[PDB]
Structures are given as structure tokens and as C-alpha cells.
Scaffold this active site. Sequence first.
Site, PDB file in Angstrom:
ATOM      1  N   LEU A   3       0.828  -1.201   0.000  1.00 28.41           N
ATOM      2  CA  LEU A   3       0.000   0.000   0.000  1.00 28.41           C
ATOM      3  C   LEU A   3       0.868   1.258   0.000  1.00 28.41           C
ATOM      4  CD1 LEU A   3      -2.586  -1.180   2.677  1.00 28.41           C
ATOM      5  CD2 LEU A   3      -2.393  -1.787   0.258  1.00 28.41           C
TER       6      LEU A   3
ATOM      7  N   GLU B  71      -7.510   1.529   9.239  1.00 27.82           N
ATOM      8  CA  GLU B  71      -7.870   0.934   7.957  1.00 27.82           C
ATOM      9  C   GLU B  71      -7.868  -0.589   8.043  1.00 27.82           C
ATOM     10  OE1 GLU B  71      -6.216  -0.765   4.901  1.00 27.82           O
ATOM     11  OE2 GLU B  71      -8.405  -0.845   4.726  1.00 27.82           O
TER      12      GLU B  71
HETATM   13  N1  LIG Z   1      -5.117   0.287  -1.577  1.00 28.83           N
HETATM   14  C1  LIG Z   1      -5.484  -0.988  -1.288  1.00 28.83           C
HETATM   15  O1  LIG Z   1      -6.387  -1.329  -0.394  1.00 28.83           O
HETATM   16  C2  LIG Z   1      -5.049  -2.239  -1.837  1.00 28.83           C
HETATM   17  C3  LIG Z   1      -4.169  -2.033  -2.764  1.00 28.83           C
HETATM   18  N2  LIG Z   1      -3.550  -2.951  -3.494  1.00 28.83           N
HETATM   19  C4  LIG Z   1      -2.555  -2.795  -4.554  1.00 28.83           C
HETATM   20  O2  LIG Z   1      -3.091  -3.341  -5.748  1.00 28.83           O
HETATM   21  C5  LIG Z   1      -2.251  -4.435  -6.206  1.00 28.83           C
HETATM   22  C6  LIG Z   1      -3.116  -5.504  -6.829  1.00 28.83           C
HETATM   23  O3  LIG Z   1      -2.293  -6.559  -7.364  1.00 28.83           O
HETATM   24  P1  LIG Z   1      -2.839  -7.520  -8.510  1.00 28.83           P
HETATM   25  O4  LIG Z   1      -3.563  -6.762  -9.550  1.00 28.83           O
HETATM   26  O5  LIG Z   1      -3.506  -8.709  -7.945  1.00 28.83           O
HETATM   27  O6  LIG Z   1      -1.383  -7.986  -9.127  1.00 28.83           O
HETATM   28  P2  LIG Z   1      -0.890  -8.872 -10.428  1.00 28.83           P
HETATM   29  O7  LIG Z   1      -1.858  -8.667 -11.523  1.00 28.83           O
HETATM   30  O8  LIG Z   1       0.525  -8.550 -10.700  1.00 28.83           O
HETATM   31  O9  LIG Z   1      -1.043 -10.318  -9.778  1.00 28.83           O
HETATM   32  C7  LIG Z   1      -2.339 -10.837  -9.426  1.00 28.83           C
HETATM   33  C8  LIG Z   1      -2.326 -12.346  -9.473  1.00 28.83           C
HETATM   34  O10 LIG Z   1      -3.613 -12.854  -9.032  1.00 28.83           O
HETATM   35  C9  LIG Z   1      -3.945 -14.020  -9.769  1.00 28.83           C
HETATM   36  N3  LIG Z   1      -5.183 -13.759 -10.502  1.00 28.83           N
HETATM   37  C10 LIG Z   1      -5.819 -12.555 -10.679  1.00 28.83           C
HETATM   38  N4  LIG Z   1      -6.920 -12.637 -11.387  1.00 28.83           N
HETATM   39  C11 LIG Z   1      -7.016 -13.986 -11.697  1.00 28.83           C
HETATM   40  C12 LIG Z   1      -7.963 -14.726 -12.431  1.00 28.83           C
HETATM   41  N5  LIG Z   1      -9.039 -14.185 -13.008  1.00 28.83           N
HETATM   42  N6  LIG Z   1      -7.765 -16.059 -12.552  1.00 28.83           N
HETATM   43  C13 LIG Z   1      -6.686 -16.603 -11.972  1.00 28.83           C
HETATM   44  N7  LIG Z   1      -5.726 -16.012 -11.259  1.00 28.83           N
HETATM   45  C14 LIG Z   1      -5.953 -14.690 -11.158  1.00 28.83           C
HETATM   46  C15 LIG Z   1      -2.756 -14.338 -10.680  1.00 28.83           C
HETATM   47  O11 LIG Z   1      -1.899 -15.272 -10.058  1.00 28.83           O
HETATM   48  P3  LIG Z   1      -1.061 -16.529 -10.770  1.00 28.83           P
HETATM   49  O12 LIG Z   1       0.259 -15.731 -11.111  1.00 28.83           O
HETATM   50  O13 LIG Z   1      -0.817 -17.420  -9.554  1.00 28.83           O
HETATM   51  O14 LIG Z   1      -1.882 -16.720 -12.044  1.00 28.83           O
HETATM   52  C16 LIG Z   1      -2.130 -12.959 -10.850  1.00 28.83           C
HETATM   53  O15 LIG Z   1      -0.739 -13.053 -11.174  1.00 28.83           O
HETATM   54  C17 LIG Z   1      -1.472  -4.856  -4.971  1.00 28.83           C
HETATM   55  O16 LIG Z   1      -0.236  -5.479  -5.333  1.00 28.83           O
HETATM   56  C18 LIG Z   1      -1.238  -3.524  -4.269  1.00 28.83           C
HETATM   57  O17 LIG Z   1      -0.137  -2.784  -4.800  1.00 28.83           O
HETATM   58  C19 LIG Z   1      -3.853  -4.448  -3.279  1.00 28.83           C
HETATM   59  C20 LIG Z   1      -4.792  -4.711  -2.293  1.00 28.83           C
HETATM   60  C21 LIG Z   1      -5.426  -3.662  -1.537  1.00 28.83           C
HETATM   61  C1  LIG Z   2      -6.793  -8.017   5.421  1.00 32.28           C
HETATM   62  O1  LIG Z   2      -5.433  -7.660   5.435  1.00 32.28           O
HETATM   63  C2  LIG Z   2      -4.901  -6.981   4.340  1.00 32.28           C
HETATM   64  C3  LIG Z   2      -5.707  -6.656   3.240  1.00 32.28           C
HETATM   65  C4  LIG Z   2      -5.161  -5.977   2.153  1.00 32.28           C
HETATM   66  C5  LIG Z   2      -6.028  -5.629   0.973  1.00 32.28           C
HETATM   67  C6  LIG Z   2      -6.820  -4.362   1.173  1.00 32.28           C
HETATM   68  C7  LIG Z   2      -6.377  -3.389   2.063  1.00 32.28           C
HETATM   69  N1  LIG Z   2      -7.107  -2.233   2.242  1.00 32.28           N
HETATM   70  C8  LIG Z   2      -8.276  -2.036   1.541  1.00 32.28           C
HETATM   71  N2  LIG Z   2      -9.000  -0.881   1.724  1.00 32.28           N
HETATM   72  N3  LIG Z   2      -8.722  -2.995   0.657  1.00 32.28           N
HETATM   73  C9  LIG Z   2      -8.001  -4.156   0.469  1.00 32.28           C
HETATM   74  N4  LIG Z   2      -8.455  -5.106  -0.418  1.00 32.28           N
HETATM   75  C10 LIG Z   2      -3.815  -5.619   2.156  1.00 32.28           C
HETATM   76  C11 LIG Z   2      -3.006  -5.942   3.254  1.00 32.28           C
HETATM   77  O2  LIG Z   2      -1.658  -5.590   3.272  1.00 32.28           O
HETATM   78  C12 LIG Z   2      -1.116  -4.906   2.171  1.00 32.28           C
HETATM   79  C13 LIG Z   2      -3.554  -6.622   4.343  1.00 32.28           C
HETATM   80  O3  LIG Z   2      -2.759  -6.941   5.424  1.00 32.28           O
HETATM   81  C14 LIG Z   2      -2.591  -8.294   5.740  1.00 32.28           C
END
Ligand SMILES: NC(=O)C1=CN([C@@H]2O[C@H](COP(=O)(O)OP(=O)(O)OC[C@H]3O[C@@H](n4cnc5c(N)ncnc54)[C@H](OP(=O)(O)O)[C@@H]3O)[C@@H](O)[C@H]2O)C=CC1
Ligand SMILES: COc1cc(Cc2c[nH+]c(N)nc2N)cc(OC)c1OC
Length: 186
Positions: free
Chosen positions: A22, A30
Site C-alpha cells: 500500500l 484501515e
Molecule cells: N489500496 C489498497 O487497499 C489495496 C491495494 N492494493 C494494490 O493493488 C495491487 C493488486 O495486485 P494484482 O492486480 O492482484 O497484481 P498482479 O496482476 O501482478 O497479480 C495478481 C495475481 O492474481 C492471480 N489472478 C488474478 N486474477 C485472476 C484470475 N481471473 N484467474 C486466476 N488467477 C488470477 C494471478 O496469479 P497466478 O500468477 O498465480 O496466475 C495474478 O498473477 C497490490 O499489489 C497492491 O499494490 C492491493 C490490495 C489492496
Molecule cells: C486483510 O489484510 C490486508 C488486506 C489488504 C487488501 C486491502 C487493504 N485495504 C483495503 N481498503 N482494501 C483491500 N483489499 C492488504 C493488506 O496488506 C497490504 C492486508 O494486510 C494483511
Amino acid sequence: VGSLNCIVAVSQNMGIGKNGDLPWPPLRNEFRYFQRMTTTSSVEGKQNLVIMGKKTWFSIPEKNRPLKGRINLVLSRELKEPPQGAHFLSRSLDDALKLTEQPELANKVDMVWIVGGSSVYKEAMNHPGHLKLFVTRIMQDFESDTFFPEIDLEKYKLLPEYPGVLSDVQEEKGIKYKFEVYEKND
Ligand SMILES: NC(=O)C1=CN([C@@H]2O[C@H](COP(=O)(O)OP(=O)(O)OC[C@H]3O[C@@H](n4cnc5c(N)ncnc54)[C@H](OP(=O)(O)O)[C@@H]3O)[C@@H](O)[C@H]2O)C=CC1
Ligand SMILES: COc1cc(Cc2c[nH+]c(N)nc2N)cc(OC)c1OC
């Protein structure tokens, strides 16, 4: 039943995270809000099914995994068997959604919650049925590598104040952010 709820945070610069992290440091509010929010089930006697991506899973510390209170589902197309600590594994989004939608699992599962990542959101973003999307806007400039797709206001409704979710802007470690709710019309 057969309901999908999206919940993710984003920076004021349309950022989600960098290197799987993040933009802003660990937020106690959060983190607790996210857990408490999801934990707050509307129906008693049922469990919530959440889905996380490979990056999200590996990003979450083992100290919390497995996340009690809710079932953790990982989406992997390369992996054959579910990862250690995970509850279930799905090849594709349609597979995980179809399984959870089937009566076999529908009896144990009622509602689903998307906890990232962008890949999962992109696939679900093309859903025709009704779906909820919770976007948290962080009032602060931060560095990010991945950008979030612009949501269509014509199809999505902007919910600044929705029951259950707080509307007031929170502040932690000098970081201000607000919780926004988005609803997609069928
Ligand atoms: N502000 C916030 O609350 C949050 C922010 N974030 C940010 O957003 C980013 C999101 O990362 P993300 O887009 O997942 O990264 P990537 O696209 O780089 O990786 C996601 C992985 O999820 C799997 N996957 C996703 N969709 C599918 C599908 N339809 N079928 C099968 N497998 C799938 C794949 O794994 P495989 O390689 O095993 O196929 C894929 O490589 C985080 O890294 C972070 O920086 C993330 C969470 C919360
Ligand atoms: C539920 O715990 C976590 C969840 C997430 C994803 C995430 C975070 N924050 C928000 N607002 N949405 C999400 N999907 C990211 C994390 O770390 C980057 C976490 O810590 C374990």
C-alpha cells in the site's frame, strides 16, 4: 446469496500500491475497519467467502493467515494445489464464483467479498449482474506503480454516505482518507 461485494482502497492519485504494498504505511484504523467491516455479517449462522490474488496472499503476513472469521480463497492459474494456509483455490474468477454460487457451497456461503487485487477487479468489472464496489480515497500524495481503472458513473452510483459505512474522514499517522461506496445498476 449470489451477491458480490468489492472492497479496495485507492490514493488520491488513483494509486493502489507499489511492489505489492500500500502507498501509505500500515493503518491501524484501515486494517481494523476492513476486518471489522467484513466480519460484520448481515445474516447470522453463515460465513463470508473472500477472494484474494496471488500477490495479495503472499503480501499478507502469516501472523494473520489464516484469517479467522472468514474463508480465504486464493486465485491461481499456474498453481495446481491451494497454497499453504489458504482455504480453497480457484483457477479463474468464473470458477470460484460458480463454485460459491452452486447449491453445494451456497448452503455454507451466502455473500462474497473481493479483497483484491486489480486483476480480480478487472475480471469482475465485466459482471452484468448487480455488484457493489467500495473505493477508499486517500487524501494524500504517494508513489504507486499500479493504477486503478476509472469507474463509469453512468453505470456506477456514487454513495458518499451508506448505512454501516462511515462517511466522516478518518486520520491516522497524519494520513487523511475517506470511505466511498459505489453501486452498479443491473
Ligand atoms: N489500496 C489498497 O487497499 C489495496 C491495494 N492494493 C494494490 O493493488 C495491487 C493488486 O495486485 P494484482 O492486480 O492482484 O497484481 P498482479 O496482476 O501482478 O497479480 C495478481 C495475481 O492474481 C492471480 N489472478 C488474478 N486474477 C485472476 C484470475 N481471473 N484467474 C486466476 N488467477 C488470477 C494471478 O496469479 P497466478 O500468477 O498465480 O496466475 C495474478 O498473477 C497490490 O499489489 C497492491 O499494490 C492491493 C490490495 C489492496
Ligand atoms: C486483510 O489484510 C490486508 C488486506 C489488504 C487488501 C486491502 C487493504 N485495504 C483495503 N481498503 N482494501 C483491500 N483489499 C492488504 C493488506 O496488506 C497490504 C492486508 O494486510 C494483511
